[PDB]
């Protein structure tokens, strides 16, 4: 069921109450301790990522250790793929939670303007222009999850076979929804290299962290220093 | 025409008169200076990459400054794709163009065995098991050359168009040559993510430089220190 | 001087009971939730570093903005120096503040084996070979803390003067305590280059996150994966 | 003996002509070719480095394998240390062997400005303010050369022993040459961590390669496919 993929994708997508609420500030968590925020949002993100994977057919039938291995190897790219696709809605930017979100400047003043340019140019814009739908996105993420190159896999050949079945379905799906675009399938697959190197840069540069800034760092450190000697 | 790409592949390949010349040696030059000998080796492989690119249909039709951009953006992966495939003939190392064979334990030379094993497992090992031919290898490198994401391109849309004509022909080729492998075309394309990340790791470990420079440098060092 | 710095090393770090809790039960909180758990663990460790810094003579008399700068510049080296010295007792892996022994094989399984081995050979064994004592360790860390090369300092010269006071006192201590080892003082300082490069490699490898986050994450993963759909 | 080392640094102490030929252009090599230019050097630098090391007492006495491993473990820091001291005579710039001056502007333009500025503020400026002399520089370099943490050497102990002889000598030097400044020995030694991190960053960020500029890349690259 190429739907059980799209379904898993749609069953994890952020609502419109976290887009709204956070946009104006109608959410709780009172922005006062931004040491919690990143942590809480991180745990929620991780939780939802695991739920999404368990819904991917055959994933849970994989060995325990291998499931952990695949998640540790793809979580980064799986997250980048999602927010890039959600960013199709914003004008020249990335979407996280609060009223549209981070623009180039914020990224620029954060020192990561160059990788921000890469995300918009290689992912967001490309997804928007060929109008990647949520079913194709779900399939690409599943292909990412079923990464046969992951180190430690008890049986990489099994992971590769599940990957084959996933993209075999994506090809049929494309062949049915866009007969006019015979090269759509390949085009989809040809976004994975960009996802790979962008994923590596965001990792090595801690993209998202630097976006937040270093003032909260100085703030919490200051709080420790004003701790009662 | 996937055959015009297949031809560009063979032409730029050694004539076994160079292969012998190293995996069997034959340097009618005798190594002497190190850093200079290394650059000459680099200049050599670099020029052969440019020769190859010129023989790729339409490449030379793109604006000159864009050709340079695509070259500076893909040289790294293009060379890795070349020796990873050529290394299918051997059992446990990477076979360089200059015929030189660099084993694993000997290559790792307590310095780059990590990415070295990645080349064997993610690229070399996979290419051998599926037995991709020079035509498929050629099309994959052509796809890599025609990278529409290359920063600074004046017309990404035209590079993308050229890229599409290539994998469309690659797909037709695969479905005609290997009738009973419907997922072969996709499997070929799915090695690009690996090539992309290995490409990056080879840059931060000067994999190349060391691969073609530690011997000339160690030789130099031994005479100097004698 | 030497005595106040030694007192700083001894104060925050031990109680035969602390090294207890995390290495045979007799511990609370039970690992369950991911990110927030590790963030609290990190917060605690960093605080111990701040309390220590505040006990080093003159550090507190510097502008608050400079204390923050020095802490941001040296925290990673200050911590590695601490656990590296604590590990001279064993010949396998490293001992954490909680006295728990992280074995060599755990570092290699986590993909940080090469850097872990550097800590072992360049710091742990070297400290063991010369039997570096706690006074000398504290002085080296104080020197690392007063790093005049830190960017943004309002007055690097004052930080440099605080550094020289520390190493002038360290040298007197060594020559008085170990008169038969004339090159001891230099040998102590010559471990700083190693601490520097190891410090940088630990950052690029996310050494610290893996040290406190790898286990709680896999536990969370393995539990949710086999749990009821 | 380090004036045999200071004589080792003087046996190559960038003469005079070499500086006027480059700090003007009265040098052959017709600055027409690039690859050839940057290459004649680094080969010349490597040669001068190896000859410098052979003159360091006891080095040539180590097993051959240990010698090459020490040289390849330290060449980067050895080179950075040398042009840093030589640049004391210049402001916000660096001087290479031939009198080739590289200003920080070129570094910030190529994307390696922060590392270039670390060389200026952590090495050059420090060396200048304390007036580090060539003998002290030669000893710091000998210490870096005898790096006992170097991987794969047959006897780390023997290397650290040679390292101790060097710094014991450096301390003696400082005490008698500068009796009025007791912290000088330590100060010299405390420039080593900075040299360590700078060397690593220079390698990580392809320092030298980026200083060449991108134009000479597009140059002969445009040449290769613009043949005649
Ligand atoms: C542009 C370039 C370099 C290129 C090296 C190459 C291209 C090496 C080896 C290729 C092999 C071994 C290819 C194959 O056999 O297919 C080096 C690092 C010297 C540094 C200067 C920039
Ligand atoms: C600053 C910082 C972190 C710090 C971790 C520390 C400082 C942990 C533990 C050290 C140990 C294990 C020391 C010892 O036992 O000696 C982590 C990675 C969470 C991520 C956020 C940034």
From Swiss-Prot, chains A, C:
Annotated phenotype, changing residue 204 to N/Q/K/A: As a heterodimer with NR1H4, impairs interaction with coactivator NCOA1. Impairs transcriptional activity
Maturation and modification: Acetylated by EP300; acetylation enhances DNA binding and transcriptional activity. Phosphorylated on serine and threonine residues mainly in the N-terminal modulating domain. This phosphorylation is required for repression of cAMP-mediated transcriptional activity of RARA.
Entry superkingdom: Eukaryota
Residues modified to Phosphoserine: 29-30
Induction / repression: Down-regulated by aging. Induced by pulsatile shear stress.
Residues annotated for all-trans-retinoate binding in this entry: 86, 97
Domain NR LBD: 1-228
Disulphides: none
Tissue: Expressed in lung fibroblasts (at protein level). Expressed in monocytes. Highly expressed in liver, also found in kidney and brain.
Complex formation: Homodimer. Heterodimer (via C-terminus) with RARA; required for ligand-dependent retinoic acid receptor transcriptional activity; association with RARA is enhanced by pulsatile shear stress. Heterodimer with PPARA (via the leucine-like zipper in the LBD); the interaction is required for PPARA transcriptional activity. Heterodimerizes with PPARG. Heterodimerizes (via NR LBD) with RARB. Heterodimerizes with NR1H4; the heterodimerization enhances the binding affinity for LXXLL motifs from coactivators. Interacts with NCOA3 and NCOA6 coactivators. Interacts with coactivator FAM120B. (Microbial infection) Interacts (via the DNA binding domain) with HCV core protein; the interaction enhances the transcriptional activities of the RXRA/RARA and the RXRA/PPARA heterodimers.
Domain notes: Composed of three domains: a modulating N-terminal domain (AF1 domain), a DNA-binding domain and a C-terminal ligand-binding domain (AF2 domain).
Family under the similarity heading: Belongs to the nuclear hormone receptor family. NR2 subfamily.
Functional description taken from the UniProt entry: Receptor for retinoic acid that acts as a transcription factor. Forms homo- or heterodimers with retinoic acid receptors (RARs) and binds to target response elements in response to their ligands, all-trans or 9-cis retinoic acid, to regulate gene expression in various biological processes. The RAR/RXR heterodimers bind to the retinoic acid response elements (RARE) composed of tandem 5'-AGGTCA-3' sites known as DR1-DR5 to regulate transcription. The high affinity ligand for retinoid X receptors (RXRs) is 9-cis retinoic acid.
Listed name of the protein: Retinoic acid receptor RXR-alpha
The organism of origin for this protein: Homo sapiens
Range covered out of full length: 231 to 459 of 462
């Amino acid at each position: 069921p190429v739907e059980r993929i799209l379904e898993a994708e749609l069953a994890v997508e952020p609502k419109t109450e976290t887009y709204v609420e956070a946009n104006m500030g109608l959410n709780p968590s009172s922005p006062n301790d931004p040491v919690t925020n990143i942590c809480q949002a991180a745990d929620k993100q991780l939780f939802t990522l695991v739920e999404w994977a368990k819904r991917i057919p055959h994933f849970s039938e994989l060995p325990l250790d291998d499931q952990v291995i695949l998640l540790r190897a793809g979580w980064n790219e799986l997250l980048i793929a999602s927010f890039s696709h959600r960013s199709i809605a914003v004008k020249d930017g990335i979407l996280l939670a609060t009223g549209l979100h981070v623009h180039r400047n914020s990224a620029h003043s954060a020192g990561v303007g160059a990788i921000f340019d890469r995300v918009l140019t290689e992912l967001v814009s490309k997804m928007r222009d060929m109008q990647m739908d949520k079913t194709e996105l779900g399939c690409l993420r599943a292909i990412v999850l079923f990464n046969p190159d992951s180190k430690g896999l008890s049986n990489p050949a099994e992971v590769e076979a599940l990957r084959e079945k996933v993209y075999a379905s994506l090809e049929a799906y494309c062949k049915h929804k866009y007969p006019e675009q015979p090269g759509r399938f390949a085009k989809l697959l040809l976004r994975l290299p960009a996802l790979r190197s962008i994923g590596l840069k965001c990792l090595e540069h801690l993209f998202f962290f630097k976006l937040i800034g270093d003032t909260p760092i100085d703030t919490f450190l200051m709080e420790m220093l004003e701790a009662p000697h």
